[PDB]
Design an enzyme around this catalytic site. Structure first.
Site, PDB file in Angstrom:
ATOM      1  N   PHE A  75      22.145  -1.944  12.027  1.00 21.53           N
ATOM      2  CA  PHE A  75      20.752  -1.860  11.606  1.00 21.53           C
ATOM      3  C   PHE A  75      19.920  -1.944  12.880  1.00 21.53           C
ATOM      4  O   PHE A  75      19.457  -3.014  13.293  1.00 21.53           O
ATOM      5  CB  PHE A  75      20.485  -2.972  10.602  1.00 21.53           C
ATOM      6  CG  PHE A  75      19.121  -2.955   9.979  1.00 21.53           C
ATOM      7  CD1 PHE A  75      18.232  -1.912  10.166  1.00 21.53           C
ATOM      8  CD2 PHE A  75      18.734  -4.039   9.198  1.00 21.53           C
ATOM      9  CE1 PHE A  75      16.977  -1.954   9.576  1.00 21.53           C
ATOM     10  CE2 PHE A  75      17.497  -4.084   8.629  1.00 21.53           C
ATOM     11  CZ  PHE A  75      16.615  -3.036   8.821  1.00 21.53           C
TER      12      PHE A  75
ATOM     13  N   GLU B  94     -12.321   0.810   1.080  1.00 21.22           N
ATOM     14  CA  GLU B  94     -13.762   0.575   1.136  1.00 21.22           C
ATOM     15  C   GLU B  94     -14.058  -0.789   1.742  1.00 21.22           C
ATOM     16  O   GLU B  94     -13.452  -1.781   1.352  1.00 21.22           O
ATOM     17  CB  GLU B  94     -14.433   0.584  -0.263  1.00 21.22           C
ATOM     18  CG  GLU B  94     -14.134   1.814  -1.082  1.00 21.22           C
ATOM     19  CD  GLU B  94     -12.785   1.736  -1.800  1.00 21.22           C
ATOM     20  OE1 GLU B  94     -12.425   0.636  -2.291  1.00 21.22           O
ATOM     21  OE2 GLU B  94     -12.080   2.777  -1.853  1.00 21.22           O
TER      22      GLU B  94
ATOM     23  N   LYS C  91      -7.640  -7.497   0.272  1.00 17.64           N
ATOM     24  CA  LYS C  91      -8.702  -7.799  -0.683  1.00 17.64           C
ATOM     25  C   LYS C  91      -9.406  -9.108  -0.342  1.00 17.64           C
ATOM     26  O   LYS C  91      -8.755 -10.156  -0.222  1.00 17.64           O
ATOM     27  CB  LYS C  91      -8.150  -7.918  -2.104  1.00 17.64           C
ATOM     28  CG  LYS C  91      -7.540  -6.656  -2.653  1.00 17.64           C
ATOM     29  CD  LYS C  91      -6.902  -6.967  -4.034  1.00 17.64           C
ATOM     30  CE  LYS C  91      -6.314  -5.678  -4.668  1.00 17.64           C
ATOM     31  NZ  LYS C  91      -5.617  -6.025  -5.930  1.00 17.64           N
TER      32      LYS C  91
ATOM     33  N   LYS D 180     -12.196 -10.461  -5.081  1.00 11.57           N
ATOM     34  CA  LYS D 180     -11.193  -9.807  -5.925  1.00 11.57           C
ATOM     35  C   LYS D 180     -10.427 -10.889  -6.654  1.00 11.57           C
ATOM     36  O   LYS D 180      -9.646 -11.619  -6.045  1.00 11.57           O
ATOM     37  CB  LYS D 180     -10.263  -8.929  -5.098  1.00 11.57           C
ATOM     38  CG  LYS D 180     -10.827  -7.572  -4.838  1.00 11.57           C
ATOM     39  CD  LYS D 180     -12.020  -7.596  -3.950  1.00 11.57           C
ATOM     40  CE  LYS D 180     -12.450  -6.162  -3.656  1.00 11.57           C
ATOM     41  NZ  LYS D 180     -13.743  -6.096  -2.945  1.00 11.57           N
TER      42      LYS D 180
ATOM     43  N   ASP E 208      11.785   3.780   6.320  1.00 12.68           N
ATOM     44  CA  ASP E 208      11.298   3.899   4.957  1.00 12.68           C
ATOM     45  C   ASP E 208       9.775   3.879   4.929  1.00 12.68           C
ATOM     46  O   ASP E 208       9.164   3.140   5.696  1.00 12.68           O
ATOM     47  CB  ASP E 208      11.805   2.796   4.023  1.00 12.68           C
ATOM     48  CG  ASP E 208      11.884   3.280   2.598  1.00 12.68           C
ATOM     49  OD1 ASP E 208      11.001   2.911   1.788  1.00 12.68           O
ATOM     50  OD2 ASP E 208      12.713   4.182   2.340  1.00 12.68           O
ATOM     51  N   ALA E 209       9.169   4.712   4.081  1.00 10.06           N
ATOM     52  CA  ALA E 209       7.713   4.697   3.958  1.00 10.06           C
ATOM     53  C   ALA E 209       7.279   3.328   3.450  1.00 10.06           C
ATOM     54  O   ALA E 209       8.032   2.634   2.778  1.00 10.06           O
ATOM     55  CB  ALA E 209       7.210   5.798   3.012  1.00 10.06           C
TER      56      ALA E 209
ATOM     57  N   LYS F 177      15.637  -8.280   5.560  1.00 18.01           N
ATOM     58  CA  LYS F 177      15.383  -8.801   4.213  1.00 18.01           C
ATOM     59  C   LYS F 177      16.445  -9.832   3.899  1.00 18.01           C
ATOM     60  O   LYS F 177      17.512  -9.839   4.516  1.00 18.01           O
ATOM     61  CB  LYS F 177      15.393  -7.696   3.152  1.00 18.01           C
ATOM     62  CG  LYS F 177      16.735  -7.128   2.852  1.00 18.01           C
ATOM     63  CD  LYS F 177      16.729  -6.249   1.606  1.00 18.01           C
ATOM     64  CE  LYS F 177      18.179  -5.919   1.177  1.00 18.01           C
ATOM     65  NZ  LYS F 177      18.982  -5.297   2.275  1.00 18.01           N
TER      66      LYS F 177
ATOM     67  N   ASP G  36      -8.013 -10.690  -8.532  1.00 19.02           N
ATOM     68  CA  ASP G  36      -6.573 -10.484  -8.390  1.00 19.02           C
ATOM     69  C   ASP G  36      -5.954 -11.479  -7.416  1.00 19.02           C
ATOM     70  O   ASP G  36      -4.832 -11.931  -7.618  1.00 19.02           O
ATOM     71  CB  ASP G  36      -6.228  -9.084  -7.834  1.00 19.02           C
ATOM     72  CG  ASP G  36      -6.243  -7.994  -8.880  1.00 19.02           C
ATOM     73  OD1 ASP G  36      -6.229  -8.305 -10.075  1.00 19.02           O
ATOM     74  OD2 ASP G  36      -6.197  -6.824  -8.503  1.00 19.02           O
TER      75      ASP G  36
ATOM     76  N   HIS H 161       9.292  -5.299   7.760  1.00 18.70           N
ATOM     77  CA  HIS H 161       9.574  -4.387   6.655  1.00 18.70           C
ATOM     78  C   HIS H 161       8.352  -3.481   6.451  1.00 18.70           C
ATOM     79  O   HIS H 161       7.221  -3.950   6.477  1.00 18.70           O
ATOM     80  CB  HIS H 161       9.886  -5.215   5.392  1.00 18.70           C
ATOM     81  CG  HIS H 161      10.253  -4.384   4.200  1.00 18.70           C
ATOM     82  ND1 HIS H 161       9.313  -3.717   3.446  1.00 18.70           N
ATOM     83  CD2 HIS H 161      11.448  -4.147   3.609  1.00 18.70           C
ATOM     84  CE1 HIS H 161       9.912  -3.064   2.467  1.00 18.70           C
ATOM     85  NE2 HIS H 161      11.209  -3.299   2.544  1.00 18.70           N
TER      86      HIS H 161
ATOM     87  N   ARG I  23       3.149  -3.409  -2.427  1.00 19.47           N
ATOM     88  CA  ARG I  23       4.428  -3.024  -3.022  1.00 19.47           C
ATOM     89  C   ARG I  23       5.502  -4.093  -2.885  1.00 19.47           C
ATOM     90  O   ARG I  23       6.697  -3.814  -3.063  1.00 19.47           O
ATOM     91  CB  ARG I  23       4.902  -1.701  -2.421  1.00 19.47           C
ATOM     92  CG  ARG I  23       4.001  -0.523  -2.863  1.00 19.47           C
ATOM     93  CD  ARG I  23       4.237  -0.102  -4.344  1.00 19.47           C
ATOM     94  NE  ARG I  23       5.596   0.386  -4.466  1.00 19.47           N
ATOM     95  CZ  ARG I  23       5.962   1.635  -4.260  1.00 19.47           C
ATOM     96  NH1 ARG I  23       5.042   2.565  -4.014  1.00 19.47           N
ATOM     97  NH2 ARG I  23       7.256   1.942  -4.318  1.00 19.47           N
ATOM     98  N   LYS I  24       5.103  -5.310  -2.582  1.00 20.41           N
ATOM     99  CA  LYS I  24       5.999  -6.441  -2.534  1.00 20.41           C
ATOM    100  C   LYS I  24       5.381  -7.584  -3.293  1.00 20.41           C
ATOM    101  O   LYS I  24       5.422  -8.745  -2.851  1.00 20.41           O
ATOM    102  CB  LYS I  24       6.309  -6.831  -1.090  1.00 20.41           C
ATOM    103  CG  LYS I  24       7.258  -5.839  -0.395  1.00 20.41           C
ATOM    104  CD  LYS I  24       8.666  -5.954  -0.986  1.00 20.41           C
ATOM    105  CE  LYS I  24       9.578  -4.829  -0.544  1.00 20.41           C
ATOM    106  NZ  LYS I  24       9.262  -3.546  -1.193  1.00 20.41           N
TER     107      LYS I  24
ATOM    108  N   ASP J  93       6.686  -2.046   4.012  1.00 22.19           N
ATOM    109  CA  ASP J  93       5.696  -2.482   3.019  1.00 22.19           C
ATOM    110  C   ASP J  93       4.943  -3.725   3.489  1.00 22.19           C
ATOM    111  O   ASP J  93       3.714  -3.832   3.342  1.00 22.19           O
ATOM    112  CB  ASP J  93       6.369  -2.796   1.685  1.00 22.19           C
ATOM    113  CG  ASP J  93       6.860  -1.574   0.967  1.00 22.19           C
ATOM    114  OD1 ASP J  93       6.209  -0.519   1.032  1.00 22.19           O
ATOM    115  OD2 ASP J  93       7.889  -1.687   0.299  1.00 22.19           O
ATOM    116  N   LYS J  94       5.683  -4.703   4.026  1.00 24.91           N
ATOM    117  CA  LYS J  94       5.042  -5.950   4.480  1.00 24.91           C
ATOM    118  C   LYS J  94       4.188  -5.727   5.714  1.00 24.91           C
ATOM    119  O   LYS J  94       3.148  -6.385   5.869  1.00 24.91           O
ATOM    120  CB  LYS J  94       6.113  -7.003   4.737  1.00 24.91           C
ATOM    121  CG  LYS J  94       5.774  -8.324   4.036  1.00 24.91           C
ATOM    122  CD  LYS J  94       5.850  -8.149   2.501  1.00 24.91           C
ATOM    123  CE  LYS J  94       5.218  -9.322   1.751  1.00 24.91           C
ATOM    124  NZ  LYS J  94       3.722  -9.237   1.741  1.00 24.91           N
TER     125      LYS J  94
ATOM    126  N   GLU K 237      -6.413  -0.613   2.005  1.00 24.64           N
ATOM    127  CA  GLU K 237      -5.043  -0.212   1.763  1.00 24.64           C
ATOM    128  C   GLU K 237      -4.461   0.346   3.053  1.00 24.64           C
ATOM    129  O   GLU K 237      -5.184   0.940   3.854  1.00 24.64           O
ATOM    130  CB  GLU K 237      -5.000   0.897   0.706  1.00 24.64           C
ATOM    131  CG  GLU K 237      -5.805   0.565  -0.527  1.00 24.64           C
ATOM    132  CD  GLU K 237      -5.173  -0.522  -1.391  1.00 24.64           C
ATOM    133  OE1 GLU K 237      -4.172  -1.118  -0.950  1.00 24.64           O
ATOM    134  OE2 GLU K 237      -5.689  -0.773  -2.513  1.00 24.64           O
TER     135      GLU K 237
END
Ligand SMILES: [Cl-]
Ligand SMILES: [Cl-]
Ligand SMILES: [K+]
Ligand SMILES: [Mg+2]
Ligand SMILES: [Mg+2]
Ligand SMILES: [Mg+2]
Ligand SMILES: [Mg+2]
Ligand SMILES: [Mg+2]
Ligand SMILES: [Mg+2]
Ligand SMILES: [Mg+2]
Lengths: 368, 374, 376, 368
Positions: D220, D54, D255, D259, D228-229, D151, D261, D13, D234-235, D15-16, D41
């Site tokens: 598919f 960075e 990260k 971090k 898709d971008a 998915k 997060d 996918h 984003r997941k 995003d993944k 990123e």
């Protein structure tokens, strides 16, 4: 405490504008009592501009009214700050009844004086009106040195007992009077003290410490519009109660009687004066509010500052006022004769506390 | 005790307020380059023209005509149909170019400050509501989505009547009695849409629901449609909305307009300081409402007299002499000092010129940042 | 019962939020000319550049670079020292370009949308979130609208985090006190830390945080780890859709996944969340409970949700229960996607204002999901 | 009684894919320099991948080569499939830049951990099933016609009694699987049902009414960035608990462990899992908050949804947590071994509920 009020002479640039606006109003009313007038004036070096809206059947030469009003006030020379003969005149006038606008208006009265007005304002305006009277009606060999600009301010020390205002003494009298180059300061001072201050200010409230100041910041030859811009409606506190009571913000001059800013204020004055004159209180503030297109006021308010006669309260006073007085604009106009060309006389010297027979809002009614 | 009281406000596009905003835009333009400028700037307007006149002493180099045109553009007067078009109007500029702290007052000035705990702003509710209505209309018109509210035009006014109870001088609003809104609009929107828009997005947004009831009288353009407005309909001049600018009929006014005058005009800076004092007293819990009265005398820096009226609402122990002692210990009413303490030689004045000078908590309005007093 | 809870916000100049604002600026630009536009617009940023990518089907003729550059200018990024300069940056556009009264289109997947409301605040939002976002919104407002000679030392990046101590009585949340307020604000080199801290305390915290919830022990941390001059995209890469909890409820309620910004209203991840918020807010506003979570479960190819679930956390008004509330909600509200879009006027260019400050709890004229309905 | 759905996506996918690249770069740095700071990123669209952010590292990494090798390993080796590692453009916009118990957090933020006794993994059943389906598709493909994108979404009917979640039945299983063009739909559907869905989903929760949808939107064959971008982070709901619990907003991939997060969320998972595994509640949500430059959390919160064991409550559980667990970044990084290059494995299939020995945050502590 100390409290001060100001008045200005007819030649003060702001009051010059009010007087021109009302001279145009009266000129329209003399030919067409139904005229609608919303006439603004401003002035600075070498020019007057009149702008706003008029609906009239009258045939008025607006420029000629402007120039004649300036002549009558005395601005006939550049040295004085404006010359009616040489100045530019710009004319930008666009050619069950409800109120014509929204707004609130206050009326006020106090038994401090026979005029039922606050003492500071009575005195300051007496000073400026007397200066203008002397300048315009005295012989030129005695008074020709006076020029049109000027102002006066009077500071009084008060005691306040249970809402009742008791002047104790006059603390300061400040007078600014424009003059020609040929009179020396000592003569200016002696003339103003003897022919003005001691004529209008009661000696029983003056004493040796009363501060009397006459052109205290130096000589005052440069004046009028050349020295300071003027505009209609920039002396609304001078026009009304001198800082006492309250103000709704609406100017008077240049507005015909369908503008409740003027007629509603005049009626509110008639009401407060009537309440105080009838002995029902010592001090009274009335607020009336209108909405556009609606004849009956949106609201009415009375405050007697705790001075109501035993047996009366602000709510009972409002009940009485509502039985006796009618604030619908058409009725105000008829009852106060506000279609008559009487308004130039109001535009200098204060609209209230005035003894001319043509000011019906100053003729109080007995209330019980 | 029970009574009615009304206050009014006008929109930023009202012709008089348009002049106040231009006058203060020119003042700010001078001060950003020369903080010592003296400015006494008047503006007037009628169909197709703006005239700026008065006097300035400045080292600033200001394009006054572009300041005028940009201010009118920003307010939204960009077409004759709206009442004025900044692109086509005539602009006349007749401005005549002419650490000390102990300068005296210029005359026997009277400054008044007022505050009341009726609202979080410490301002009278009638005035808070009327000015909130007009400020919200201006905000929607200028910042909203044009396909949704592009039918709004710049002129407008509001008036609010509140029914109060008075218990021992303390004012407790009982209910909102009347709300009057006049809003200028284009020819394509119907009255029902105007009225529903104003009721839902302005009145119910800014007026507290617990003071409104089924009898609250709501009047929205009650005299008919309002398409012709601005200078085309009505002349404007600087300094003709001095009660909107201050307390809406409450308190008191000594005379003298604010806009177009730099801070050496004590009619302006002294009124700002008096507001700060009254606001601080009320904010500190020392009374529920008070009027601060400052009397100046010519040539003297400190006031001749200071008078505080708490209308009988002072906290027990804070009699008039005690409040006066506190105020005189904390506050300095000398013109030279109040100008520095309030940072008034700073181009902060354009924001004051619509929406009222008092009861708004902008970073640049130091007279609205109360001091804790005990 | 007492507990602590925290929520965060970021300033409009935070790099992730900058991207969200650009994505919705592009969406609005398309909708302004073609209300039928389909938009799936992603933005990313790093030193000296913004890239917009994704897919758009529109009839609008948009200068995309100009939309981006004007948005960055409005946010205040006008110099490399602040972290980005709209005048010099490269804007890279990699957008793949491609009966309007139909109401019965089905959902595209097994979606989950949540709405939340609570009577803790006038906004009907959780207090931790209201305060954090109020802080950052006030910073932005001062920076952008304030007098430059007074506050021009402010730079656009920043964040805030607020911890509230709560009492919980029978499911009802009663804020007891503000426990910790953390603010990080980017600034130029000429302002000293003490001036920064006094400015933030007096003009931001004390303006938006209620004084009756603050006390002597409230912990106030302002740039606690040192100076914050280096920020924005030069310091920190940004991407659309990386602040989805700031965008919603600050850790309260729930999230089914999916970012909002850059997506037109046919993406039910956005429009469905807006509708769920309107329902939860309407329940609380009507007094039927003190706090409410509304859960909507969609199924692929089906217009009406498979399931609707309401949790009032035991706070239901006397006389109402969760089943009674669902009956009410089902009579009043229509969760079909085409209906959601029409009822909320979402084919309108209303989205730029949502993209900073939270999508919920703010009363703008164009946000119909914040105008509650009276339910009985 | 309600329906709840969770989603997972395959490693291909878009995003993944970005998450995996970001974490492949992190691992590449850590394997040479365990002290590396990484904030990497990734974004992607047709024909291109950009990595940006960075890095502070002593490592010597060919970032472009990490990117291409990761995409090769995921299986994107032809433009027909949506991306070709050999020909795609790779843009590199990565900018290259003491006492442990006293190291402050690197940022502010708030993170949640969650656990529930619904499954042996102590994870929500919807999420367990959806991520098991996609992990199994990836395993079959990588370890002959499957392609990398896909998915799965699983809808479960639940009862919630006194905070306890009891699955009643599986309502819907939706699977999208990318495939070679030469495979017929009947073969695709039989393979996915028999070799994945029926192997992953417990039969006692299936019934004749269970809705099973395999590529319901058509064939598919093209996927990944061509379809898709994609972007990193984003997941985040797929990565955590599938809509259950709560989320603080912070993404994990790209990260390093400084971090919070990431590391704080990993520790919070260990805490919640430990409380549930120890039998002290059936369901547990933990919130931890940090401030920049501060080692100890600004706040800690525990909610057991009313399911705490007799004798315990959320306050006692918090006291226990504070005695046993240390949320200071320097400490939890050591305890969880977060300087080791273990992160690519986390970046698809979910960070939690995973049995790989290197995920120490899934190894619960017995608490009393
Ligand atoms: Cl007016
Ligand atoms: Cl998304
Ligand atoms: K005036
Ligand atoms: Mg004047
Ligand atoms: Mg004066
Ligand atoms: Mg006018
Ligand atoms: Mg989805
Ligand atoms: Mg970033
Ligand atoms: Mg193959
Ligand atoms: Mg995408």
């Amino acid at each position: 405490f100390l409290f001060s009020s100001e008045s200005v002479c007819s030649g003060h640039p702001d009051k010059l504008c009010d007087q021109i606006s009302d001279a145009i109003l009266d000129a329209c009313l003399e030919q067409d009592p139904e005229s609608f007038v919303a006439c603004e004036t401003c002035t600075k070096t070498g020019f007057i501009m009149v702008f706003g809206e008029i609906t009239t059947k009258a045939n008025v030469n607006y420029e000629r009214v402007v120039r004649e009003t300036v002549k009558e006030i005395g601005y006939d020379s550049e040295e004085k700050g404006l010359d009616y003969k040489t100045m530019d005149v710009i004319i930008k006038l666009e050619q069950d009844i409800g109120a014509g606008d929204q707004g609130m208006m206050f009326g006020y009265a106090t038994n401090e004086t026979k005029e039922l007005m606050p003492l500071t304002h009575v005195l300051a305006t007496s000073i400026t009106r007397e200066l203008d009277y002397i300048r315009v009606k005295g012989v030129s060999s005695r008074v020709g040195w006076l020029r049109p600009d000027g102002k006066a301010q009077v500071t009084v020390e008060y005691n306040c007992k249970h809402g009742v205002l008791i002047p104790k003494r006059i603390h300061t009298i400040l007078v600014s009077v424009q003059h020609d180059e040929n009179i020396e300061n000592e003569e200016i001072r002696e003339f103003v003290l003897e022919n003005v201050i001691k004529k209008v200010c009661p000696s029983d409230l003056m004493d040796k410490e009363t501060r009397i100041l006459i052109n205290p910041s130096g000589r005052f030859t440069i004046g009028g519009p050349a020295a300071d811009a003027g505009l209609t409606g920039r002396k609304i506190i001078v026009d009304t109660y001198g800082g006492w009571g309250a103000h709704g913000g609406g100017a008077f001059s240049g507005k015909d009687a369908t503008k409740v800013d003027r007629s509603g204020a005049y009626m509110a004055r008639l009401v407060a004066k009537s309440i105080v004159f009838s002995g029902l209180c010592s001090r009274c503030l009335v607020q009336v509010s209108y909405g556009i297109g609606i004849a009956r006021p949106l609201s009415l308010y009375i405050n007697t500052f705790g001075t109501a006669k035993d047996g009366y309260n602000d709510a009972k006073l409002l009940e009485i006022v509502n039985k006796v007085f009618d604030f619908r604009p058409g009725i105000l106009i008829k009852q106060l004769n506000l279609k008559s060309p009487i308004f130039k006389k109001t535009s200098s010297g204060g609209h209230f506390g005035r003894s001319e027979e043509e000011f019906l809002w100053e003729k109080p009614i007995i209330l019980q």
